[PDB]
C-alpha cells in the first residue's frame, strides 16, 4: 500500500479529492451505494474504504473508527493519497431542549475536549469547519427540506459539564469533529460535518427506532448531496 494503515495506493482512488468519513466501518458500504459503481477498496483495522462516483466524479468513503486518534490516521493517510476535502457524517445526541430527534446539525466548529487536536494546534486555535463545505452542507439540507441547526458541537475523547455546554449554546456531543476540524484547518484541507440527531439528552422520552434509522438515512443522503455540490 502507499500508506501505513488504510492499505490504499493512490491509483486506487482514481483521482478522488474528496472523502466522506463516517465513524463505523460497517456504514461505509451503504453510504458508497448511494453513489454509482460502489467498489470496495480495502479493509484494515477499523478502516474500511470504498470508492464510488458522485455525478461522475470519484469519491472515497472511509471509516475513521471512534475518536480523534483513529480519525487522525485516516485523515492524514487519505490526504497523502490526494484527498483535500473531508465530509464527516454521523448520528449524534443533542443537548439543547428544542433540537429534536430527527433534526440535523451542521457543526460549524467544535469545543476541543479531545487530545488529538492538540497535536495539530495549541488549544487557542479554533476547531472550525471550512466555510464553503459548511455552506454546501447547509444547502444540501435545505434542498432536502431540512432546516439544519448550525452551531457548535462538543467533541470529546470518551463516550458520552454538560450543563456548561448547554448554557453556551453547544448543540450536541460527538468524538471526532474537533480532531477532524483542527487537523484539516491547520494543514490546508477542507472539512465539514453533518449529523442526524438520534437522541436528545434533555428529553425524558426514549427515541423511536424507526425515527432514528430515517434520521441517519437523511444525514447520509445530505452529506452525499453536499459532496456533489462541492465536486460540481
From CA 88, how far away is CA 176, in angstroms rounded?
9
How many residues touch Li ion under the rule CB under 5 A: the total is: 4
Q: How many residues in the chain?
A: 232
From CA 146, how far away is CA 158, in angstroms rounded?
30
69 binds its own copies (CB under 8 A): yes
Of the residues 18, 46, 146, 191, which one makes contact with Li ion according to CB under 5 A: 46
Contacting Li ion within 62-81 (CB under 5 A) = 65-66, 70
Question: What nine digits make up the cell of 168?
Answer: 453556551
- Least Å distance, CB 46 to Li ion, is 5
Stretch that binds its own copies, among 31-39, 86-94, 107-115, 220-228 (CB under 8 A): 107-115
* 71 vs 148, beta carbon nearer its own copies: 71
Contacting its own copies within 113-152 (CB under 8 A) = 113-116, 118-122
Distances (CA, A) of 35 to 51, 203, 220: 9, 35, 11
Q: Which residues of 127-150 are buried (b: 16+ CB within 10 A; e: fewer)?
A: bbbbeebbbbbbebbeeeebebbb
| Whether the Cβ atoms of residue 177 and residue 88 lie closer than 8 Å to each other | yes
Stretch that binds Li ion, among 7-15, 38-46, 49-57, 150-158 (CB under 5 A): 38-46
181 binds its own copies (CB under 8 A): no
Residue 115 interaction partner, one of its own copies, Li ion, none, beta carbon < 5-8 Å per kind: its own copies
Contacting Li ion within 147-186 (CB under 5 A) = none
Cα–Cα–Cα angle for 106, 18, 121, rounded to 5 degrees: 65
- Least Å distance, CB 65 to Li ion, is 3
**Cβ count near 53 (within 10 Å):** 17
What is the three-class DSSP state of 119?
helix
Of the residues 108, 110, 134, 156, which one makes contact with its own copies according to CB under 8 A: 156
From CA 134, how far away is CA 226, in angstroms rounded?
9
Stretch that binds Li ion, among 6-14, 59-67, 145-153, 192-200 (CB under 5 A): 59-67
Of the residues 14, 29, 42, 45, which one makes contact with its own copies according to CB under 8 A: 45
Identify any residues that bridge with 35 across adjacent strands, giving them in sequence order: none
Please give the residue ranges that form the binding site for Li ion (CB under 5 A). Answer: 46, 65-66, 70
Amino acid at each position: 500500500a502507499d500508506v501505513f494503515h488504510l492499505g490504499l495506493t493512490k491509483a486506487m482512488l482514481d483521482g478522488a479529492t474528496l472523502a466522506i468519513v463516517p465513524g463505523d466501518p460497517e456504514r461505509v458500504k451503504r453510504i458508497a451505494e448511494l453513489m454509482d459503481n460502489a467498489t470496495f477498496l480495502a479493509s484494515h483495522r477499523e478502516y474500511t474504504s470504498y470508492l464510488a462516483y458522485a455525478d461522475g466524479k470519484p469519491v472515497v468513503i472511509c471509516s475513521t473508527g471512534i475518536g480523534g486518534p483513529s480519525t487522525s490516521i485516516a485523515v492524514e493517510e487519505l490526504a497523502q493519497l490526494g484527498v483535500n476535502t473531508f465530509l464527516r457524517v454521523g448520528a449524534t445526541g443533542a443537548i439543547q431542549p428544542h433540537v429534536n430527534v430527527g433534526d440535523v446539525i451542521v457543526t460549524q466548529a467544535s469545543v476541543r475536549l479531545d487530545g488529538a487536536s492538540l497535536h495539530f494546534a495549541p488549544m487557542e486555535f479554533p476547531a472550525v469547519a471550512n466555510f464553503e463545505c459548511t455552506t454546501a452542507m447547509v444547502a444540501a439540507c435545505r434542498d432536502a427540506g431540512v432546516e439544519p441547526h448550525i452551531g457548535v458541537t462538543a467533541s470529546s475523547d470518551t463516550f458520552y459539564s454538560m450543563k456548561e455546554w448547554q448554557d453556551m449554546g453547544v448543540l450536541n456531543y460527538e468524538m471526532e469533529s474537533a480532531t477532524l476540524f483542527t487537523m484539516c484547518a491547520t494543514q490546508g484541507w477542507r472539512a465539514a460535518c453533518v449529523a442526524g440527531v438520534i437522541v436528545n439528552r434533555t428529553q425524558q422520552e426514549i427515541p423511536d427506532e424507526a425515527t432514528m434509522k430515517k434520521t441517519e438515512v437523511s444525514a447520509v443522503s445530505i452529506v452525499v448531496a453536499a459532496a456533489k455540490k462541492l465536486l460540481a
